[PDB]
RNA sequence: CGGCGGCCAUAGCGGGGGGGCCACACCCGGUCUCAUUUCGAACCCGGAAGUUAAGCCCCCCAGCGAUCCCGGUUGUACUGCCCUCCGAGAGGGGGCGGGAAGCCGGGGACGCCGCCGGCCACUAUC
RNA sequence: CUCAGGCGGGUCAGGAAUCCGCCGUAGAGUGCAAGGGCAAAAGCCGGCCUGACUGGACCCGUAACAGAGGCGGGUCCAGCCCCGAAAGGGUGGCCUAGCGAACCCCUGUGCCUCCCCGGUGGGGGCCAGGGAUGACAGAAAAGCUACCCUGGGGAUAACAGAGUCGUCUCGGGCGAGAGCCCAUAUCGACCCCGAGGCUUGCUACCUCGCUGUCGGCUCUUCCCAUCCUGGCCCUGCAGCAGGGGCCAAGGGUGGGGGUGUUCACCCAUUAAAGGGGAACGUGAGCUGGGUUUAGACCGUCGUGAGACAGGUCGGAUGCUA
RNA sequence: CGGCCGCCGAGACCCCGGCGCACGGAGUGAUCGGGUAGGCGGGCGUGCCGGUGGCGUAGAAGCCGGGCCG
RNA sequence: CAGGAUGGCCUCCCCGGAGGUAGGCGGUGGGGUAGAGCACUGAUUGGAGGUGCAGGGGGCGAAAGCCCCCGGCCUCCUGUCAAACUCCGAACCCACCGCCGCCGUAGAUGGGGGGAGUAGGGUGGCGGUGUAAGCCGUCCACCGAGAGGGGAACAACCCAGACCGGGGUUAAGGCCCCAAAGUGCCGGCUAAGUGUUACUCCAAAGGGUGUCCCGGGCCUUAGACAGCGGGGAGGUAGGCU
RNA sequence: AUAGGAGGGUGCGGCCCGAAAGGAAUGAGCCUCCCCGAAGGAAACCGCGGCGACGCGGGAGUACGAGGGGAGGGGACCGGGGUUGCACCGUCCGUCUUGAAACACGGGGCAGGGAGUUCGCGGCCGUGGCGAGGUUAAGGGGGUUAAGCCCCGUAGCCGCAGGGAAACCGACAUGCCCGCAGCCGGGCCGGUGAGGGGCGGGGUGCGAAAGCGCCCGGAGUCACGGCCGCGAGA
């Protein structure tokens, strides 16, 4: 099946406590923390309520790869590579990120490695805020594939 | 309380279209409700002579056994465990 | 045909035909068991000679009613959610998630189903 | 066994009770508020009958969740009856209002118990039933304080401000209507929309370890929706003189008589004798007349003490910047 | 007013080390770090007693001013 | 009633022990608020056609006499609209089961014990009252007790929840100067010093051949759009007064 | 003696001194080179697009980067103190309050004084002794200069049986089923399961009768300290 990105805008503050909630089992805490979610329709029904709260858009494989490399750790700044993989339980990030794409295995089962990729903020301006939507010109919501330019610029 | 004993939000929840009034079917009365079943416990005003107060309506719970005519239910109303003694009019089956 | 039910008008109204109706009605005797603060009308004892004409059963016709659906109005009325988004402090709108009634047009629908007997039957006529 | 009500026919003054048929899903009735429920009934009738019963639970309301007494109902079973052919029903009135603690007393019934010991008298007690707190989860209860005192409070009244703008003031739009005729020379209803903070009131925000009231007096600032002076336009402007409109705060806008009086009334003058804000400007500037304390009289009311937006007389104005 | 583009700009968010807390034995924590009322727990200082062990005219305490640590 | 006590609630300790369901979806339950309407219970506005009748006017008078008529009393296809009306009714809230998610054996879920505290405010939504401001319900981010950056400053509007030090980049918002960063770009609107103010700050109905832009009508050598050169007949004084 | 204030904080300059206790001369502030290097990340110029503002490709995650390591140079201050200028920020303190910088309350300044204590009882807790028992009070004997400690004293209290108004009566040293800890066997699972939970039966009271109430398969007692209520002036 797909796997998807949820990024959120809106922290810890500023959230009725039902949206709160709603968050949480997402596997959101704070502005900046990203998470891949697969398509389920109780977890797609919980993406929908939450949308304003949050910039959501579908990844790809290549673009997680690239994203499990450099954000990823377990203890301070280490970038994921074959020879780390190797030793967790894969031979390789790619059969890793295939793995998330079948679905079978999410971020966590896959050892030493977060649930949440800790990313910096984005680059320049916005456009449009982030207070509106992508529609109207912010980032707020399912938004594409556009999530994968996003996090180019955020690192 | 000041406004309740057994009425207090009804007129209008106690009410139906003229097609849902009339006593309503015989065998309603005399179905049997067994114990270990999971009933939905539905305010029947036709019948006064035991009647759930308006608070209770839409709760559901497990026929923990019979006393007479009646049966006593355990529900769940809120955080609390009550029993429940309902006349089988005012229970309908779970599936 | 019958009897006992379930869903309880999708089995309502109206009109039409037949009976594959001893048995179910009308109908006839009421002395007796028995109903009437008046009448065997009612209730009950008794019988079938006569009538299928109801009823009752079966079939059919929708014009009325009720059940359900399609399309139009309408994704409109209305709404959950967010905004340094707009207005002089009310408030509203957009996105996003949903979306009703009344009415018009076009239709299915004048039952279905369960058990058991019975002239006839050994089956379904009904 | 099924209803108000309607329809037609009979009876009567129409009508009712009463009669006959047809229509009639509930509008009837159920003691009584309201609502809900109900048509082979809880509605109507006839007969029988007195369970509006004793005992002990269960559950909910009471008091949602979630503590919370008393009390109420519903629902069981045990016992005794009642009715019914039996099944089955009846723990009063279709349901929801018509109830009451701790304590004390008395009733009904039996027993327990009463100081070395018995008999008797007379007591005490278990249970249940009945009896009030109605200011109703239950003190034993009438007034005054301006002769007052204290603790506190700006959680809260009086002054002022802030907020507010119904009330008030003022404006604009529409133009019924009269002005001989002609809505606008002039006057202008019904209705509708703003502005101001200047009357009244609402607000309880600010102060009760004080922000002293009103009026006058004196001294000064500002504003214009401008009374006069200047400059202008119309006219149902002949003149003389009015009426209406526009600009404009530069200057001026007085003195007397009554009231404590802001305000208001009056006289004669005047070119005109304009208004409003500034702690209802101005009491560490005056005055202290009025609101107004402890003294007193009268009217009204009260048994009385005593009261008054009734009248009235007299009743401190601190301080060296 | 309707589009569009480049930047500026927080204790946020990111990042390196240190530090406490929580957990691990006789390193680990994306899912730890605001704080009144209030609860809980640890240490310091003060006077005198007892026990133990020292110091003083070859200069006590106190005072004053300066250094240093937690 | 400017007061206590008992819960809810807060903390600490102890005990038992495996699920728990704030989240989301489907299945199985409950429902009359927005909306909507004439089908009741219901209040009423208006004219028809009935002339069914109680009666205030008339007629063959025997003043509504047999029979028709007119205030009119109430049917009928119609006619206004309805917290306490309904032929109806969302979005949405909530009960329960399964699943999925997440959380949990460093102890959740629940129980017992000890020690407390027991003036609230506030923006928005949905309201009830009251012109209003104010008061009071309900849910709520938040302030209260919580900083920091931005909104000129501005308890609660925005961004953000904060161990110590260092480096970096954005967010809210802004980019003429004060003040970091645009004497930005394209096009339309503007001539009022409007505006340059999300705001707590920032006045209306009405009206202007003031503008710009879209609409279909009239009408174009069948060319009056205005000018101008010529126009304004005869019956006839239309009659009356 | 032409410039602004809750009197300062933080950074960075000036001026001023610094014998000691500090760190360093066995090398201080300081300087230089080389390398590793988080988050981050250019420039010149070129090419191609875009009405243009400007984007895109290559340069390039390169140059560059906090921080750290090592080596080297120099040779006495540096830290720290006094005061002050500049940039930036900054409306006391305590109390009251929904909100305090306050036109709410209180304070001239400094020093000294200055407010959770004792007893009884009850409910908790921790530790410690002993154990179906535990604990002694008063007193005199004794010992000592006195006295405490040491021994005697068991008076008396509490627990070992509860229900009941009293009369008066009087029980399970666990039979059945789960399951935590733990143990055991197998490869999470299956037993055994104290503690524990869930039944059954029993004792007593009310009771014509039935139905409910309490109790029941051995742990308490005393000491110390502390926590809190209530009573006391508290």
């Known amino acids: 099946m797909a796997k998807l990105a949820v990024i959120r805008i809106r922290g810890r503050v500023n959230v009725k406590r039902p949206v709160r909630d709603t968050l949480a089992m997402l596997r959101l805490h704070r502005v900046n923390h990203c998470v891949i979610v697969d398509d389920t329709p109780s977890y797609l029904g919980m993406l929908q309520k939450a949308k304003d709260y949050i910039t959501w858009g579908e990844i790809n494989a290549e673009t997680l790869a690239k994203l499990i490399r450099k954000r990823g750790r377990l203890i301070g700044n280490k970038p994921v590579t074959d020879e780390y993989v190797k030793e967790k339980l894969g031979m390789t990030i790619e059969e890793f990120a295939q793995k998330v794409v079948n679905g079978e295995m999410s971020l966590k089962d896959l050892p030493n490695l977060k649930p949440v990729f800790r990313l910096h903020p984005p680059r320049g301006g916005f456009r449009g805020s982030k207070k509106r939507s992508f529609k109207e010109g912010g980032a707020l919501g399912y938004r594409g594939e556009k999530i994968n330019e996003l996090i180019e610029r955020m690192l | ?95």
Do not use: N, W
């Open chain 2, 1 to 95: 309380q000041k406004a309740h004993s057994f009425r207090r939000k009804t007129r209008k929840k106690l009410s139906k279209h003229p097609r849902r009034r009339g006593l309503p079917p015989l065998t309603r009365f005399l179905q049997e409700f067994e114990v270990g079943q999971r009933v939905h416990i539905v305010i029947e005003p036709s019948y006064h002579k035991g009647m759930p107060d308006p608070r209770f309506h839409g709760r559901t719970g497990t026929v923990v056994g019979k006393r007479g005519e009646a049966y006593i239910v355990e529900i769940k109303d809120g955080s609390k465990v009550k029993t429940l003694f309902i006349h089988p009019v005012h229970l309908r089956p779970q599936k």
